[PDB]
Design a protein around this ligand. Structure first.
Ligand SMILES: Cc1cc2nc3c(=O)[nH]c(=O)nc-3n(C[C@H](O)[C@H](O)[C@H](O)COP(=O)(O)OP(=O)(O)OC[C@H]3O[C@@H](n4cnc5c(N)ncnc54)[C@H](O)[C@@H]3O)c2cc1C
Ligand SMILES: NC(=O)C1=CN([C@@H]2O[C@H](COP(=O)(O)OP(=O)(O)OC[C@H]3O[C@@H](n4cnc5c(N)ncnc54)[C@H](OP(=O)(O)O)[C@@H]3O)[C@@H](O)[C@H]2O)C=CC1
Length: 308
């Protein structure tokens, strides 16, 4: 008698792809050092700000999956001669990545530029270091991090993706795995519906890629853009993400009542409210309380949020 079955720890059941997931392999103490393969501006010269897509070599050392983030320790020192703290960035590439070899990682980065009260133009440290990164240069990577935005295991589930700006990143990751890749253990056949809010047409992130996916899965891939500074509803209201969702109120509510519907939200912290305003009305007319219904969804792993 050399064996025994040690009593199992009690554990919560998960509908998301978390089998053998990995977080915090690399710490800022000793980050993984990768290199820049490419770094391109994906927004028009005319857009209000610049958004860049960049790819780094990982030689397969960072075991990330769709929905996770990585931290970046930008080169340099702060005002006190100290190294910079890491900044997190949502992975914009699928697990196998942009080269299809599982040895790279991609980021979608907004270059932060603003002016303080003193009237001075200020440049965000990490975002400007990243957008200025030249191919061939090293970059310090930490993580992976996150489990909230992991994809659902069900290959026939409806996945509603709500994003603003660079919040599109994890959704480009999901969609590549869903429509640009042939997976043995996972071939997507549900409904993927993406809503993306950006300020202008020159700001439509990954427009061409999404159009190729629509042209490849015209039935089960739905795409709706909400261009806030160019589009307007019948009342002249700016077309924010919730304003566009409003045009499909009946359908979305109907999907939200389905048990295989998962909603994911990523991007601006403020997008969360307009969406709830929209939802509270629908549930109301349906004699349902969104407050309570949302709680259920969240506990059922069907209302996933990662905003900041
Ligand atoms: C989980 C997670 C994932 C993220 N993923 C992404 C991603 O994929 N892409 C992406 O672009 N960003 C992402 N971010 C944000 C990112 O981590 C950085 O915060 C961002 O790039 C800005 O950092 P920075 O180092 O450039 O700026 P910093 O040097 O840190 O400066 C930011 C500071 O400047 C001030 N500030 C910022 N904006 C303004 C403004 N308009 N006016 C006045 N003051 C201002 C604030 O005090 C703020 O604390 C994510 C955030 C989190 C938490
Ligand atoms: N995992 C995470 O937590 C992630 C978080 N983020 C967060 O998102 C930020 C990226 O923003 P960036 O790409 O510059 O986006 P933007 O400032 O470019 O704007 C995004 C779009 O959303 C609109 N918008 C602004 N406020 C709201 C609101 N309250 N409700 C609905 N729509 C709104 C804007 O309209 P208009 O400009 O006309 O007002 C704009 O069209 C990052 O700095 C980060 O903080 C990004 C990626 C991942």
């Amino acid at each position: 008698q050399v064996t025994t079955e040690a009593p199992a720890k009690v554990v919560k059941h998960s509908k998301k792809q978390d089998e053998n997931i990995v977080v915090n392999k690399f710490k800022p103490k000793e980050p993984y050092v990768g290199r820049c393969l490419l770094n391109t501006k994906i927004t028009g010269d005319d857009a209000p700000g610049e958004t860049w897509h960049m790819v780094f070599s990982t030689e397969g050392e960072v075991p990330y999956r769709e929905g996770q983030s990585i931290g970046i320790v930008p080169d340099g020192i702060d005002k006190n001669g100290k190294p910079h703290k890491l900044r997190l960035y949502s992975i914009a590439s699928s697990a196998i990545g942009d080269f299809g070899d599982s040895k790279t990682v991609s980021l979608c980065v907004k270059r932060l530029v603003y002016t303080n009260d003193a009237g001075e133009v200020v440049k965000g440290v990490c975002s400007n270091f990243l957008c200025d990164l030249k191919p061939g240069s090293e970059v310090k990577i930490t993580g992976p991090v996150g489990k909230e935005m992991l994809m659902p295991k069900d290959p026939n589930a409806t996945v509603i993706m709500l994003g603003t700006g660079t919040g599109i990143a994890p959704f480009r990751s999901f969609l590549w795995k869903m429509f640009f890749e042939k997976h043995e253990d996972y071939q997507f056949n549900g409904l993927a519906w993406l809503f993306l809010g950006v300020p202008t047409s020159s700001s439509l992130l990954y427009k061409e890629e999404f159009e190729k996916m629509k042209e490849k899965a015209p039935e089960n891939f739905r795409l709706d853009f909400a261009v806030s500074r160019e589009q307007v509803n019948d009342k002249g209201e700016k077309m924010y993400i919730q304003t566009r969702m409003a045009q499909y109120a009946e359908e979305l509510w109907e999907l939200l009542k389905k048990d295989n519907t998962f909603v994911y939200m990523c991007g601006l912290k403020g997008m969360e409210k307009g969406i709830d305003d929209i939802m509270v009305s629908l549930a109301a007319k349906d004699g349902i309380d969104w407050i309570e219904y949302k709680r259920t969804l969240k506990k059922a792993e069907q209302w996933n949020v990662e905003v900041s």
